[PDB]
Amino acid sequence: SHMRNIIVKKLDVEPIEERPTEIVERKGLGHPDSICDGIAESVSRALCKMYMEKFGTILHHNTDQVELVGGHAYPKFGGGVMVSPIYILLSGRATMEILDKEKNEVIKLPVGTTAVKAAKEYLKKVLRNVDVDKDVIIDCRIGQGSMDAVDVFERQKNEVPLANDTSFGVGYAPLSTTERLVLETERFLNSDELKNEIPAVGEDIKVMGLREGKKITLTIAMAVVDRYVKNIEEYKEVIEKVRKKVEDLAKKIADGYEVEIHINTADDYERESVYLTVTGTSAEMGDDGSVGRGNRVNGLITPFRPMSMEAASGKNPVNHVGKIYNILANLIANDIAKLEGVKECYVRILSQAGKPINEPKALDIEIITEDSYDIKDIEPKAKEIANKWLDNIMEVQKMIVEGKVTTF
Amino acid sequence: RNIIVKKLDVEPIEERPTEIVERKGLGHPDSICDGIAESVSRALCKMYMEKFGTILHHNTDQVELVGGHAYPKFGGGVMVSPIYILLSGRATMEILDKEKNEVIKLPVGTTAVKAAKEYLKKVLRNVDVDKDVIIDCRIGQGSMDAVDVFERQKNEVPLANDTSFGVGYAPLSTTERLVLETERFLNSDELKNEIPAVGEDIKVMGLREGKKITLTIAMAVVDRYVKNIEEYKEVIEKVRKKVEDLAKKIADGYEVEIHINTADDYERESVYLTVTGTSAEMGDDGSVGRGNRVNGLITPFRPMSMEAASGKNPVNHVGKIYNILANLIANDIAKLEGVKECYVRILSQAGKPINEPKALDIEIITEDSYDIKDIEPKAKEIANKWLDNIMEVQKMIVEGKVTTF
Numbered sequence: 101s102h103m104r105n106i107i108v109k110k111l112d113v114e115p116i117e118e119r120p121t122e123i124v125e126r127k128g129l130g131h132p133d134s135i136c137d138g139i140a141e142s143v144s145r146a147l148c149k150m151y152m153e154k155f156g157t158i159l160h161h162n163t164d165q166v167e168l169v170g171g172h173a174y175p176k177f178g179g180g181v182m183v184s185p186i187y188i189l190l191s192g193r194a195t196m197e198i199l200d201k202e203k204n205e206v207i208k209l210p211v212g213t214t215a216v217k218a219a220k221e222y223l224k225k226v227l228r229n230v231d232v233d234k235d236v237i238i239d240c241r242i243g244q245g246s247m248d249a250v251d252v253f254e255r256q257k258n259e260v261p262l263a264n265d266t267s268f269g270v271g272y273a274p275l276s277t278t279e280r281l282v283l284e285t286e287r288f289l290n291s292d293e294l295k296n297e298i299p300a301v302g303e304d305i306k307v308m309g310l311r312e313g314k315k316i317t318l319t320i321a322m323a324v325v326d327r328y329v330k331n332i333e334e335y336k337e338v339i340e341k342v343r344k345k346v347e348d349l350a351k352k353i354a355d356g357y358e359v360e361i362h363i364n365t366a367d368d369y370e371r372e373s374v375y376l377t378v379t380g381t382s383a384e385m386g387d388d389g390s391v392g393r394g395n396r397v398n399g400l401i402t403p404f405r406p407m408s409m410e411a412a413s414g415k416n417p418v419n420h421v422g423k424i425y426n427i428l429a430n431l432i433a434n435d436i437a438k439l440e441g442v443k444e445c446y447v448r449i450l451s452q453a454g455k456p457i458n459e460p461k462a463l464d465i466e467i468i469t470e471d472s473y474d475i476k477d478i479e480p481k482a483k484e485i486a487n488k489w490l491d492n493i494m495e496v497q498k499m500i501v502e503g504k505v506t507t508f
Numbered sequence: 509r510n511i512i513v514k515k516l517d518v519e520p521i522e523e524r525p526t527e528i529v530e531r532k533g534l535g536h537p538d539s540i541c542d543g544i545a546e547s548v549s550r551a552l553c554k555m556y557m558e559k560f561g562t563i564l565h566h567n568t569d570q571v572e573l574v575g576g577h578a579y580p581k582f583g584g585g586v587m588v589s590p591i592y593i594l595l596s597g598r599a600t601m602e603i604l605d606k607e608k609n610e611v612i613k614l615p616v617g618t619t620a621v622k623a624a625k626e627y628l629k630k631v632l633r634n635v636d637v638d639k640d641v642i643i644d645c646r647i648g649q650g651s652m653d654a655v656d657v658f659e660r661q662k663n664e665v666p667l668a669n670d671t672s673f674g675v676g677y678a679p680l681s682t683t684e685r686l687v688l689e690t691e692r693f694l695n696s697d698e699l700k701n702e703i704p705a706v707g708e709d710i711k712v713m714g715l716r717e718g719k720k721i722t723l724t725i726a727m728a729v730v731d732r733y734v735k736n737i738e739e740y741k742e743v744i745e746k747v748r749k750k751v752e753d754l755a756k757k758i759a760d761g762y763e764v765e766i767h768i769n770t771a772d773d774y775e776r777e778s779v780y781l782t783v784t785g786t787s788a789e790m791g792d793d794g795s796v797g798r799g800n801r802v803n804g805l806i807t808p809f810r811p812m813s814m815e816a817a818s819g820k821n822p823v824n825h826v827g828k829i830y831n832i833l834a835n836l837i838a839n840d841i842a843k844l845e846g847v848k849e850c851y852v853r854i855l856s857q858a859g860k861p862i863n864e865p866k867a868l869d870i871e872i873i874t875e876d877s878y879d880i881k882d883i884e885p886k887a888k889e890i891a892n893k894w895l896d897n898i899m900e901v902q903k904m905i906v907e908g909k910v911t912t913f
Contacts, residue, residue, distance in 0.1 A: 113518055120514055121869050123673055123855055125814075165793045167572040169596045169646045187646060189594060191574050191793055241574050241592065243791050266715070266724065268528060270808060308671045310855060310867055312512075317866070319671045319857060365671065366657050366859040373656040386651030388570045388597055393797045393816060403675050403811045403853055409530075411798060450526075453770075464526070 104459065104490060106483045110475040111466045115444050116276045116404065122311035124279050125401040128286045129226045130303025130323065130381040132389025136166040137508035138226065139188065139219045140391045140414030146218030147194055148417060148501045150209060157255045158501070159247060163215065164414030165191035168389040171235070173378045177335070179327040180378035186230075187237045190215050192414060196244035198252055212240050227303055228295065229325050229380040260458055260493060261419040263451040269425020270406045271398070272446045273437035278316055279400055281354045282309040285318060288349055289342065298345075300328035300338045302380025304387075315358040318346065322363055325380040332372055339363050395508040397426045406446065412507040417500045421457060425449045427505050428489060428496055435485045436465065441473035447486075458493040509868065511891045515880035516871040520848050521681045521809065527716035529684050530806035533691045534631045535708025535728065535786045537794025541571040542913040543631060544593070544624045545796045545819030548647075551623030552599060553822065553906055555615060563906075565650050565658040568620065569819030570596035573794035576640065580781035582740075584732040587640045591788050595620050595643065597819060598650035617645050632708055633700065634730050634785045657859065658824055665863050665898070666824035668856040674827065675813045676803070676834030676852045678842035683721055686759050687714040688804055690723065690751055699750070705733035705743040707785030720763040723751065727768060728782040737777050744768050800913040802831045811851055817912040822905035826856040829901050830865070832910055833894060836901070840890045841870065846878035863898045 116122065127134045143163040151159045172184035194215075198207040219238050223230060230236065275283065286307045288294060295301060302323035310317045322342065329335045343361050350359040367374040378384055392411025395401060408426050415423035433447040445467050452461035465482055469475050489496070499505050521527065532539045548568040556564045576591035599616045624643050628635060635641065650658075660667050680688070691712045693699060700706055707728030715722045727747065734740045748766055755764035772779040782789055797816025800806060815827035822828060834852040841850040853869040856862070870887050874880055904910050 121512060121853075121867070123853060123867075123869070125673070165572065165574075165795060167570065167594060167596060167795065169570070169594075170598065170648055172648060173651075175652070184648075189572060191572065193575075193791060193793075243575065245791075266713070268808065306671070308673075308855070312867070319866070321671060321858065362857070365857050366653070366667075366669075368656070368660075368859075371656065373653050375653060382651065385649070386598075386654050388567075390570060390572065390795050390797075392795075393814060401814050403673060403813060406808055407812055407814075408808055409799075409806045409812065448526075450528075462526075 102487070104463065104487060105461060106463045106465065106486050108465045108467065108475070108479040108482050111444070111446070111468045113468065115468050119404070120313060122276060122278045122404055124282045124309040126282050126286045126307050126399060127394040128303060128305035128307070129290050131306055131394065132168045132381070132383045132387050133394035134508060135383060136168050136389045136391045137394060137413040139190070139222055140164050140166045141507045142222040143190060143215045143218045144414050144417065145501055145503060146214050147211065150214050154209065155252060155256060157258055158418050159195040159252065159255060160416060160418065161192070161194035162414060162416050162420070163190065163192035163194065163242065164391050164411050166391050166414065167191070168383055170383060170385050170388045173385045175326045175376040175378050177326060177332070178330045182235050182378050182384060185235050185237045186383050188219065188239065190219055190238065190240040190242055193243035193245055195247050197246045198249050199246055200249035202249070211242060211244050215242055216240050227379065227381060229302065235379060258494065260456040263421055263453050263455055263457050264419055265421055266451055266453050267421035267425065268408070268448060268450045269422060269429045270408050270448050271426065271429030271433040272405055273430070273433040277354050277357060278309045278311045279402065281316060281318065281350060282307045283399055284353060285320070285346055285349060289322065294345070298338060298341055300325050301342060302377055304381040304383070315360070316354060317360040317362065319362045319365060320346070322375065323377045323380050323382055324375055326376050326378055332369060332374070335374060335376070336369065397507050398430055399506055399508065417497050419457070421451045424457060424496065425451065427500065428493070431496065431505070432486050432489050436467070436482045439478055439481050441470050441478045442467055443470045444468035458490040509864070509892065509895060510866060511868045511870070511888050513870045513872070513884045513887050516851065516873050518873065520873055524809065525718060527681060527683045527809055529687045529714040531687050531691045531712050531804060532799040533708060533710035533712070534695050536711055536799065537573050537575070537786065537788045537792050538799035539913060540628070540631070540786070540788065541573050541794045541796045542799060542818040544595070544627055545569050545571045546912050547623045547627040548595060548620045549819050549821060550906065550908065551619050552616065555619045556600070559614070562662065563821065563823050564600040565655045566597070566599040566821050567650070567819065567825060568595070568597035568599060568647060569796055569816050571796050571819070572596065573788060575791035575793050576789050577791060578783045578789035580731045580783050582731060582737070583735050585781070585783040587783055587789060590640055590642045592642045593624065593644070595624055595645040595647060597647050599647045601649045616647055620645050620647055632785055634732065634783070640784060661861070662823060665861045668826045668858055668860055668862050669824045670826060671856055671858045672815055672827045672830070673813055673853055673855045674815060674830030674832070674834045675811045676831065676836070676838040677810055678838040678850050682759050682762060683714045683716045684805055684807065686721060686723065686755060686764070687712050689758060690725070690754060693750070693754060694727065694747065703743060703746060705729050706747060707782055709782070709786040719761070720765070721759060722765045722767065723755070724770065725766070725768045727780065728785050728787060729780055730785045731781045731783055737774065737779070740779055741774070802912055803835055804911055804913065811853065822902045824862060826862060828912070829862060830854040830856060832901055832905065833898065837891055837894050841872070841887050844883060844886050846875050846883050847872055848875050849873035863895045
């Protein structure tokens with residue numbers, strides 16, 4: 101009986117698959133932009149766990165500022181050289197010290213050391229061929245603010261925070277064939293199973309998908325680790341080996357479509373100018389990176405779907421509307437898309453400033469129905485799903501801190 | 509050429525119930541970074557042209573602003589901690605004299621730091637670039653394979669540096685024009701000279717619901733020009749009236765509400781006061797490609813590209829060229845009779861000439877009682893016209909005749 105501003109509307113347009121063209125991009129884990137997103141969010145999570153240990157609540161912070169400066173290297177067949185380390189600057193702000201006037205005590209939290217440690221551990225986790233001791237410099241200019249113990253006491257209540265702004269979030273489901281193919285391609289090429297078989301495949305993998313009717317062209321930029329290819333011959337074999345595996349993958353999840361696969365199209369086998377790297381990432385020299393310039397929270401870049409321009413990674417998981425709403429929108433859309441009769445679902449949430457974040461000014465649910473289905477039969481199920489997620493909005497916070505949802 | 513044209517049968521933008529549009533003004537920390545990034549690129553282009561008569565490889569689309577600290581006060585406050593800015597990205601740092609067998613270093617560092625400081629002085633009137641701002645530089649040499657692609661056919665038609673897409677659309681909706689022109693007006697020299705209290709950090713958000721547009725402005729006020737809270741209120745109300753008169757010009761028929769600095773607390777005198785005219789002094793951070801698209805707007809009800817045009821080289825970086833190109837094509841197609849709305853998406857393939865996109869995608873919402881088959885060939889010609897004159901895009905960018913944010 102709790103009445104929210106939820107809107108369910110029938111959408112009478114062509115579903116995504118029936119539209120003639122589609123363009124989808126994904127920047128893989130080792131791409132400099134995705135490295136920065138990953139670090140930003142890993143630092144946030146680390147700081148959250150820090151605050152939770154000491155106070156049992158999360159204090160205010162935002163670490164959605166991370167700059168990766170390309171290093172210096174000299175790739176060579178058989179093994180190249182890393183000349184200058186990658187430089188990474190951690191920025192943002194985080195609550196550092198707590199002033200307690202009553203008991204006359206001052207607590208200070210390991211903001212800087214936690215941040216640097218978290219960033220370094222994330223790099224070790226994803227980049228197989230980067231020695232973080234010598235190949236990376238992690239610097240930190242995160243602001244260290246103070247806070248009254250009184251406000252900490254209020255935070256420990258863990259009530260639903262009030263929306264500090266009029267902001268929005270957007271999501272949709274399900275993923276189209278192209279979207280699924282782009283996503284799973286990057287995931288597969290960065291899976292441990294494949295790396296074991298083809299160690300030459302670096303983590304800096306970028307996948308572009310172009311659908312023309314029922315034909316999908318995949319264009320892949322794949323950084324090759326030079327110590328695993330002793331000449332151009334072996335380099336070529338890596339490309340064709342990967343190609344065949346991606347062909348097999350496309351036949352599993354995009355059967356019925358015509359699939360074309362292009363890899364490292366900028367290569368020139370004649371001049372021996374190819375996508376060769378020492379560390380398996382263009383972060384080593386070729387390409388710089390920063391936060392919020394790549395994937396959206398659903399892990400994709402989709403100019404045929406609605407996209408928020410806000411960078412979710414590193415944002416305050418407590419009271420940043422944009423981050424929470426973009427994740428929540430994608431969680432709601434995903435569940436509604438499972439409902440019988442729903443072919444396509446779009447969710448948009450708009451906050452009411454001054455009101456709890458789970459009491460939005462408007463939540464729009466647009467549904468393309470399957471044939472012979474009545475939107476009015478779906479609507480009550482859909483509104484229930486939305487209200488359920490809104491009721492459990494604090495659990496969504498936990499999911500983020502526990503890394504159970506993606507921010508890029 | 510791979511030019512695709514489609515009729516798009518959806519509700520036009522103005523007829524949609526809800527519309528949200530944002531613009532970050534020139535003084536906003538994110539737009540500062542975008543502007544600095546492009547200023548560095550333009551400067552390096554000029555420097556390379558002077559020494560070699562050609563533009564050498566670079567991509568300075570990386571600028572990080574770490575917020576400083578300040579202490580604003582009625583009549584004039586003071587900075588406490590300087591604003592740290594890091595110039596980053598790629599550039600041709602040196603050339604090898606194979607004949608003399610010596611490396612010759614190019615003035616990238618001095619050129620970049622100078623271009624950065626000059627831009628700040630141009631967009632932030634009340635900043636002291638000596639004590640308020642620190643500008644560091646870590647621009648480095650680009651990879652060997654990237655420079656190779658850049659040099660393969662620079663003399664002919666350049667080869668795409670990468671596989672990327674830009675987007676564009678036309679025309680602008682009433683809400684979009686209102687947001688865009690609101691910021692531009694308040695950040696115009698004519699206005700700021702009239703009302704020196706108006707800082708350049710102006711964020712404008714437009715929320716349309718039906719035929720009602722709520723215009724929300726966050727405007728930094730320069731504290732040296734407001735002696736008290738009363739004078740502060742006078743600035744707010746004076747700007748408000750200016751925006752009202754503007755709304756009557758370009759948003760006739762719409763109920764336009766105007767909210768300025770909604771977080772202000774007049775009782776506690778806790779308002780949007782600044783020393784420098786930017787929230788960069790308030791510990792707020794900024795970086796490149798976190799704000800406006802090349803059309804100058806953030807538009808979730810429109811298609812967008814995540815590529816950041818600012819700082820990228822105007823020679824072979826499709827992430828810049830195609831976003832500018834898509835906008836140019838969209839504008840022309842929108843002029844055609846029968847075209848209500850136009851959407852242009854241009855995809856590259858790394859290694860292929862920039863005038864040979866993997867796909868040049870066009871969508872058109874036709875006016876009522878208009879055939880797409882009549883408009884279709886008109887659209888292709890416009891697209892072909894521009895691809896034939898793709899080198900003019902570089903020219904327009906280097907000559908600073910187009911915005912990147």
